[PDB]
């Protein structure tokens, strides 16, 4: 939209009512008269606007009040609360702004943040922005976490995130103006080439795609309308429901052939009975004629009984010649039904072998979206985050998404090559125990008021623990960790000397031999200046291609490439990098997915902070000391960068409110 009202939309906020957030901070307003709400909503919206229209400079309260006009700029404290609320919860003055007011050195409270990922860096920025003392512990020798970027010479290529999913309400929208980011549009034209290397004709392409989408819709019907959500005391997965749906369409085809061929036998046997009347009638007319003709043989003069006999035999022959004449009508009237039905046979099969493979590539696309085999996705809940979609078209980062982490890292206490091994949290504060990854003998102790954990979900999932919590995380937190899914998705990046592909095509598919390998290198991306093609490895193929050497993997890529463009047009790559995310021990996977038997309420469980028991028993119930951010912690935007970033902003606000106090809630 447009106005102060698209400033609310660009902040994921409804511009005509108050959120559950704000009812919490402004319970006076929401329980009060509706006129004041309209005021508040306007101050909320206009302030958001002011920040968004120039997000390279801090939006100070004083400045905010100036642009405000009457009657709205008449309650200076209502404005002051709004502004502080927005600044706390990261809706304004988040990211990389120049600060008018050089922040004071009065540092109150100490926070250790585990992980220098985008969730981590975003909180760090915000906490330091709030005058806390913040230290980041990072196991790797670089920032970004799962925003990895390869750089050798002119060659730049993300091995991690690479798509900004469209800017309508995206916090990266703000970040993209704060950082020189080259956003590139993704052209939807994507042609699939099959195993041999011949482009799939458009007719097929549109035909299959439409079936895919009808097949998805079918599972949805099958989920909501028929409550097929549990089978043999086990939650049903999307992949199961798809098979049941495809079986039932292959079942329909057969049901449909059977009733058609039975329509033919219904009338063949109707004919059969007709021709028996007609064989018998014709043979019964044989003797009639013979009789009559013998009766004309008796020459006149004739007595009357002999005249009657010629005349009667003559009638019964016409009488019997009617019947046979009209039965050849009926025979003719059923002789073309059999020609009609024969030439109107219904569908031979539901999907042909060639067709089914193409369908498998549309399933590889879906397995790549959710970084996991469709047998693992909850049928019920897997599509719960297409409700909060961003408007606009998906984009890619042409300069390496890493430029964003790196930009965030300016100004921040980041200890690299520091692997946390134990987190101790007590009623009186916390100890984080880390080692050096270079030499694991050097041991470090970090003491703090609060720990912000942004450890990847797959790290949190390791048994036996890569990180021990003292005391152990409670049953409700560990069970959410088991229930949730951490999937896997890998990339092969291919560096050449000349664009030998269609440079007006961002991406093109390869259709695979089998089902079992629909994800093995099934999609290629061309997004960078240099000759670089990115190949995805999705689904069950991802977890398997990690046990296979680089050159073999590049080997199969080359083969595929050769088939689609001819063996002489594809030279060897100058530089090759293949990732291996499930192997990476600071990831253990690529991103979370809504596993069968999990739900969106688990993502909320992950974000609940932990409160230790009292030191002195019968002492007052303490504060919470262990906080959680990262993409696996945000229900409405999981498995993305924008979701990671929002989760960092969330916890910084939650920590600042619990350690600096919220003076905006009176």
């Amino acid at each position: 939209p447009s106005g102060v009202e698209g400033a609310a939309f660009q902040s994921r906020l409804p511009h005509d009512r108050m959120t559950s957030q704000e009812a919490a901070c402004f319970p006076d307003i929401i329980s009060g008269p509706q006129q004041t709400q309209k005021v508040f909503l306007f101050i909320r919206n206009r302030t958001l606007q002011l920040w968004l229209d120039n997000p390279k400079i801090q939006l100070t309260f004083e400045a905010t009040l100036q642009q405000l006009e009457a009657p709205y700029n008449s309650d200076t404290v209502l404005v002051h609360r709004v502004h502080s609320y927005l600044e706390r919860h990261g809706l304004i003055n988040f990211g990389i702004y120049k600060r008018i007011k050089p922040l004071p050195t009065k540092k109150t409270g100490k926070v250790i943040i585990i992980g220098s990922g985008v969730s981590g860096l975003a909180a760090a920025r915000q906490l330091q922005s709030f005058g806390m003392d913040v230290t980041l512990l990072e196991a790797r020798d670089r920032v970004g976490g799962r925003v990895a970027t390869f750089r050798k010479g002119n060659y730049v290529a993300d091995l991690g995130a690479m798509v900004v999913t469209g800017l309508g309400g995206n916090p990266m929208a703000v970040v993209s103006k704060q950082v020189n980011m080259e956003l590139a549009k993704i052209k939807q034209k994507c042609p699939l080439y099959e195993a041999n290397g011949q482009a799939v004709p458009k007719e097929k392409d549109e035909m299959v795609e439409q079936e895919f989408n009808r097949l998805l819709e079918a599972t949805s019907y099958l989920s909501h309308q028929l409550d097929f959500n549990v089978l043999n005391n086990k939650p049903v997965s999307l992949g199961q429901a798809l098979e049941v749906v495809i079986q039932l369409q292959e079942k329909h085809v057969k049901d449909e052939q059977i009733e058609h061929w039975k329509k033919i036998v219904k009338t063949q046997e109707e004919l059969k009975e007709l021709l028996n009347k007609m064989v018998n009638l014709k043979e019964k007319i044989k003797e009639l004629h013979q009789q009559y003709k013998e009766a004309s043989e008796v020459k006149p003069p004739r007595d009357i009984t002999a005249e009657f006999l010629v005349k009667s035999k003559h009638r019964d022959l016409t009488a019997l010649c009617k019947e046979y004449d009209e039965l050849a009508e009926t025979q003719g009237k059923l002789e073309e039904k059999l020609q009609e039905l024969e030439a109107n046979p219904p569908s031979d099969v539901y999907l042909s072998s060639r067709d089914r493979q193409i369908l498998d590539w549309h399933f590889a696309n879906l397995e790549f979206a959710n970084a996991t085999p469709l047998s693992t996705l909850s049928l019920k809940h897997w599509d719960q985050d297409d409700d909060f979609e961003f408007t606009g078209s998906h984009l890619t980062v042409r300069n390496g998404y890493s430029c964003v982490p790196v930009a965030l890292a300016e100004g921040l206490d980041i200890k690299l090559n520091t692997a946390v091994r134990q987190v101790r949290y007590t009623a009186s504060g916390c100890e984080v125990i880390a080692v050096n990854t270079r030499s694991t003998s050097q041991t470090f102790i970090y003491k703090c008021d609060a720990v912000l954990c942004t450890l990847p979900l797959g790290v949190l999932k390791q048994q036996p623990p890569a990180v021990q919590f003292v005391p152990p995380l409670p049953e409700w937190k560990t069970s959410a960790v088991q229930r949730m899914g951490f999937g896997n998705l890998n990339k092969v990046v291919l560096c050449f000397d000349r664009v030998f592909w269609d440079p007006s095509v961002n991406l093109f598919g390869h259709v695979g031999s089998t089902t079992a390998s629909r994800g093995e290198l099934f999609l290629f991306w061309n997004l960078y200046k240099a000759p670089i093609l990115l190949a995805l490895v999705a689904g069950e193929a991802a977890g398997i291609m990690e046990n296979i050497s680089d050159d073999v993997i590049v080997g199969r890529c080359l083969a595929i490439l050769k088939g689609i463009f001819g063996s002489s047009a594809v030279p060897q790559p100058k530089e090759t990098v293949v990732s291996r995310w499930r192997a990476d021990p600071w990831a253990r996977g690529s991103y979370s997915y809504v596993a069968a038997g999990s739900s969106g309420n688990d993502y909320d469980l992950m974000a609940q902070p932990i409160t230790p028991g009292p030191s002195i028993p019968g002492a007052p119930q303490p504060i919470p000391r262990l906080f959680f951010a990262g993409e696996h912690t945000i229900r409405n935007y999981p498995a993305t960068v924008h979701g990671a970033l929002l989760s960092g902003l969330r916890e910084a606000g939650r920590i600042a409110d619990q350690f600096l106090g919220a003076m905006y809630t009176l």
Partner: peptide, 4 residues
């Protein structure tokens, strides 16, 4: 999530 589904991309394009």
């Amino acid at each position: 999530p589904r991309s394009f």
